Structure 1
């Protein structure tokens, strides 16, 4: 208890310490140059080593909050660069750290991070490994100031491994670009999934978040007793509140406490944690969050005894409605690791609605008896959408699946900008690639994890620049209704076709040389524009026009005179297409 900074140095070790301190300063000091933060991290590291040698030395006795805040207040250009943030230095703890948190900028004005050429990256990696890796760690942390530093650190070690492996290969590019791409997607998805959990907490409140956490922990930890899940759900909520406010030291400490609690009580929680509970303090929390679902106990009774068929259902409910509803959710969820969390919550809200209505009626048991009937169609709707979409994904490419989604979603919401329709259809295509490789036992949770992210992204974007009442309705819907609401969108009956623009459907020989990704984006853009222009086109008409386009590109990219034929065969393509459509 003597030196917080000594204790975290000894626990983390110097290399992790230095990294996290760099991430933390970069999350706060987003416009400070790399060399200035490196010098702060080395001074903080020197000071922490005085506390490691003497837990009683000067200032070693201070809160990490206090030490962190004082270091920020030694920044010479604090007022010049960050303006009103420098006024936090005029306060004392805990007001100062509160004031610093109040001034973390969610979207700094920083240019997109452009990935250098593989050979350039590998020369840089070989020439100064430490500086190469620390600099991009800085670039990411300063652009992602709420991304949990220990997890940003876990990604950085995977990036290091990819460089170490691939800067061996003869084709550096063919090894490295696929590992970097997958790491980036997992990075972005991890950050999204955190933002989703903060939106549940922040937009729907503590009850909705705790319902969400009971279901998810009950699927993960099915041998856990309900009181043990209730306890974990309380602690989860404080971790997420702090993490959501973006207070790294408070969040880190609530996580370490919960990760120590879980590891002291494995036999009450899960047989899947032995691995995770061997790992250092730094990762242990993170390993737990990733653990595989435990096998559920054999010989579980059906839910009907307690929830459905018992005398005492209305009595037990009315005593403590949230506690009984929480029990139902735990019993349902621990039996159905194959259900989405949201599906389980839709069932618990149906059960709740039933008991509200049935417990007031003449024959309560007559009324609440039939409830499992209303559950079947709730379960079947997401299972059938997944079946139908994965069948379509299997029939078509990943790429032609995307094109099918672009036609579908453009006809439903043609007021959405082209670039966004292309990025939503392309991301949805990627959810089909990822989750259709699961067996149906694991599809619904996969689809939930990745669709909720796409839908949060879409709703954030739409809140900033709204274009459709129907999307506002779906985005402001209840947590359980959002995805069904988007699923219920029909073809827009009222949309005014977009006016013909020859420029939009004119191609050049440039298309032949473009990268695959970029060629696919140029064609998917034109397909959206075709649909905004001919929204009544049938799947036969659009398919006819797209195959003529495809024959036209295959003809014109192999022609003696590329440009002439792109121009002349282009005018014919446009004319035939207009006549055939609308």
Structure 2
């Protein structure tokens, strides 16, 4: 009967003060650093007064209420509502200056000058920019960031040690945020049942030797964890993730053989290790599948008694045999099998109706395998940057109304699928690619939601989680779109481009390629290549020869 006390005891002052800064940083975002800290110590000192006396002032309150009231300095509502208004307040792309990394001697100075203030401002500036970041995982990022600054500042060549370690984390963190933004969308827009099915098919692939009732218990506990994190109960998220990692390590025998390494590591390292663990060996003894889920007579009787748990047993069995199948594809086969039983179960002789069910699976498996083969071959012919430019032109044509910054980054990460999944074996390609495209297309979804402009994106995002990749892969070139007017200001770069990195220049060039398609969408790959060769050469012509910084200015209108 002391939630704030119960958690402090389960989590410790340091993890408490951190989770609360992520909880505050994610819910307010525009509020400054020091202001957030004020409120964090204010709660942590009050939490200790509730640890000292569980019947002291305001110690009977719930975390939502207590943290909600402290957030109120939206609001104007009660807990059932107040939190949701705040959850819908979260900016997926706030106007915050992209944080500039200062010098390595500068950063190592400040780290020494105040370790706590350095690592807290890291948690703040990240969590404000990623308001749906998995909180127990951002703490693991913070421990590793500390470890990079504690090691590499004592090193002779500090920047040779520090800069790689940081870039690794930044890349891992972008991937961790995006991955879990999809987890939140699934819960907040399509419900827990959807998440549960997703979680059944993922964990069954991860632990094929585990029996259905064991997986079901993990799926229940993992849904609890991710629900709470996505709903802003960060403290309760942290406890149950830790609680889940313990149960798995105590019952590995009944779960996976691949847990021996992860169960040696400590608390933050352990949770992160299991979340990302290689799939266990598929068992030797497995049925015909069809023999029990169509060739039986009492399949409608079982489905009628409870729908969600027969569908669970199907998904678990289907998934455990197919780790080479993407989780999204496995969910589609499960949706198909669900819509087919609703119709055939009452219809005359059900058995004679549901026999063609395995025939409906065949096209659904082919669809992703064809696009993945097609686009991995394109990536061999082009390479990351050029392959990105192919997808940049493609999606600007498909949905031109979308903002130019969104089009660039989304198609950048869409192209990143090439490096990540095409070098993989032809078997691992499908789960790698499809499930990654789920993540990158969900970014287009959550970024577009802010100021809607292309109703085609609106349409594909709202219809279904599972059929978003094929929905966007179905969209043809929008010929209804009214072409953009030529703007000389956008197609003329400044001298600032020479002081920026290779990647930053690529983004800027790729930004111009989106505008170039928006002015004339009828332009072919041949036409756009001639203007791409034109823009790439003139920047190397001006930047390399810094004589006449007005070199860029000499460029007016070529069409």
TM-score range normalised by the length of the shorter chain: 0.7 to 0.9
Pick closer, same or farther for the CA change 1:562–1:508 going to 2, 3 Å. farther
Pick closer, same or farther for the CA change 1:552–1:294 going to 2, 3 Å. same
Q: 1:458, 1:252 → 2: CA distance?
A: 29
Is the Cα–Cα contact under 8 Å of residues 26 and 128 in structure 2 kept in the other structure? Answer: yes
Displacement of 1:560: 9.0
Structure 2: runs of 5 or more not aligned: none
Pick closer, same or farther for the CA change 1:373–1:11 going to 2, 3 Å. same
Displacement of 1:298: 1.7
Q: 2:66, 2:431 → 1: CA distance?
A: 42
Q: 1:90, 1:129 → 2: CA distance?
A: 38
Q: 1:385, 1:477 → 2: CA distance?
A: 21
Q: 2:81, 2:332 → 1: CA distance?
A: 41
Displacement of 1:283: 5.1
Displacement of 1:383: 1.6
Displacement of 1:542: 2.2
Displacement of 1:213: 1.5
RMSD: 4.1
Displacement of 1:203: 1.4
Pick closer, same or farther for the CA change 1:171–1:381 going to 2, 3 Å. farther
Pick closer, same or farther for the CA change 1:428–1:29 going to 2, 3 Å. closer
Residues 236-265 of structure 1: per-residue CA shift (max 9 Å, x gap): 333233222211233334334433433333
Pick closer, same or farther for the CA change 1:424–1:99 going to 2, 3 Å. closer
Is the Cα–Cα contact under 8 Å of residues 406 and 447 in structure 2 kept in the other structure? Answer: no
Displacement of 1:174: 5.2
Q: Which residue is 2:341 aligned to?
A: 355
Pick closer, same or farther for the CA change 1:420–1:319 going to 2, 3 Å. same
Displacement of 1:278: 4.0
Is the Cα–Cα contact under 8 Å of residues 16 and 235 in structure 2 kept in the other structure? Answer: no
Pick closer, same or farther for the CA change 1:22–1:291 going to 2, 3 Å. same
Pick closer, same or farther for the CA change 1:248–1:424 going to 2, 3 Å. closer
Judge which range, 60-69 or 383-392, deviates more.
Answer: 60-69
Pick closer, same or farther for the CA change 1:503–1:348 going to 2, 3 Å. same
Q: 1:287, 1:108 → 2: CA distance?
A: 31
| Secondary structure of the structure 1 residue equivalent to 2:358 | helix
Is the Cα–Cα contact under 8 Å of residues 11 and 281 in structure 1 kept in the other structure? Answer: no
Displacement of 1:111: 5.2
Q: 2:84, 2:385 → 1: CA distance?
A: 48
Displacement of 1:333: 0.5
Residues 36-93 of structure 1: per-residue CA shift (max 9 Å, x gap): 66577668777888999999999999988898789889xxxxxxxxxxxxxx999999
Pick closer, same or farther for the CA change 1:438–1:161 going to 2, 3 Å. farther
| Secondary structure of the structure 2 residue equivalent to 1:339 | coil
Q: 1:236, 1:282 → 2: CA distance?
A: 16
Pick closer, same or farther for the CA change 1:520–1:305 going to 2, 3 Å. same
Pick closer, same or farther for the CA change 1:72–1:298 going to 2, 3 Å. same
Residues 310-352 of structure 1: per-residue CA shift (max 9 Å, x gap): 3433444344333222211111111111222110011111222
Normalised TM-score (structure 1): 0.81
Displacement of 1:378: 0.9
Is the Cα–Cα contact under 8 Å of residues 101 and 247 in structure 1 kept in the other structure? Answer: no
Q: 1:477, 1:103 → 2: CA distance?
A: 23
Pick closer, same or farther for the CA change 1:408–1:359 going to 2, 3 Å. same
Judge which range, 215-224 or 549-558, deviates more.
Answer: 549-558
Count of aligned residue pairs for this structure pair: 557
Pick closer, same or farther for the CA change 1:222–1:113 going to 2, 3 Å. same
Residues 397-419 of structure 1: per-residue CA shift (max 9 Å, x gap): 31111111111112212222222
| Secondary structure of the structure 2 residue equivalent to 1:568 | coil
Is the Cα–Cα contact under 8 Å of residues 294 and 354 in structure 2 kept in the other structure? Answer: yes
Q: Which residue is 1:518 aligned to?
A: 504
Pick closer, same or farther for the CA change 1:457–1:103 going to 2, 3 Å. closer
| Secondary structure of the structure 1 residue equivalent to 2:294 | helix
Displacement of 1:489: 0.7
Q: 2:529, 2:89 → 1: CA distance?
A: 52
Judging by fraction of residues, say which structure has more helix. Answer: 1
Pick closer, same or farther for the CA change 1:385–1:174 going to 2, 3 Å. farther
Displacement of 1:295: 1.5
Displacement of 1:23: 4.5
| Secondary structure of the structure 2 residue equivalent to 1:373 | coil
Q: 1:501, 1:466 → 2: CA distance?
A: 23
Q: 2:32, 2:38 → 1: CA distance?
A: 10
Q: 1:152 aligns with which of 126, 132, 138?
A: 138
Judge which range, 284-293 or 200-209, deviates more.
Answer: 284-293
Q: 1:310 aligns with which of 292, 296, 301?
A: 296
Q: 1:547, 1:99 → 2: CA distance?
A: 49
Pick closer, same or farther for the CA change 1:365–1:551 going to 2, 3 Å. same
Displacement of 1:363: 5.8
Pick closer, same or farther for the CA change 1:507–1:322 going to 2, 3 Å. closer
Q: 2:261, 2:468 → 1: CA distance?
A: 37
Judge which range, 188-197 or 328-337, deviates more.
Answer: 188-197
Judge which range, 325-334 or 451-460, deviates more.
Answer: 451-460
Displacement of 1:566: 5.1
Q: 1:537, 1:187 → 2: CA distance?
A: 37
Q: 1:95, 1:416 → 2: CA distance?
A: 31
Pick closer, same or farther for the CA change 1:247–1:105 going to 2, 3 Å. farther
| Secondary structure of the structure 1 residue equivalent to 2:213 | helix
Displacement of 1:568: 5.8
Structure 1: runs of 5 or more not aligned: 74-87, 573-582
Displacement of 1:120: 1.7
Is the Cα–Cα contact under 8 Å of residues 193 and 449 in structure 1 kept in the other structure? Answer: no
Residues 502-553 of structure 1: per-residue CA shift (max 9 Å, x gap): 4443456654554212321222122222222232222222223323444444
Normalised TM-score (structure 2): 0.84
Q: 2:174, 2:403 → 1: CA distance?
A: 22
Of structures 1 and 2, the one with the larger relative CO (CA 8 A, separation 6+) is: 2
| Secondary structure of the structure 2 residue equivalent to 1:502 | coil
Displacement of 1:451: 2.2
Is the Cα–Cα contact under 8 Å of residues 21 and 41 in structure 1 kept in the other structure? Answer: yes
Is the Cα–Cα contact under 8 Å of residues 402 and 426 in structure 1 kept in the other structure? Answer: yes
Pick closer, same or farther for the CA change 1:122–1:439 going to 2, 3 Å. farther
Pick closer, same or farther for the CA change 1:217–1:570 going to 2, 3 Å. same
Residues 483-513 of structure 1: per-residue CA shift (max 9 Å, x gap): 2111101011222332333444345665455
Is the Cα–Cα contact under 8 Å of residues 51 and 57 in structure 1 kept in the other structure? Answer: yes
Judge which range, 349-358 or 212-221, deviates more.
Answer: 349-358
Q: 2:227, 2:468 → 1: CA distance?
A: 23
Judge which range, 430-439 or 311-320, deviates more.
Answer: 311-320
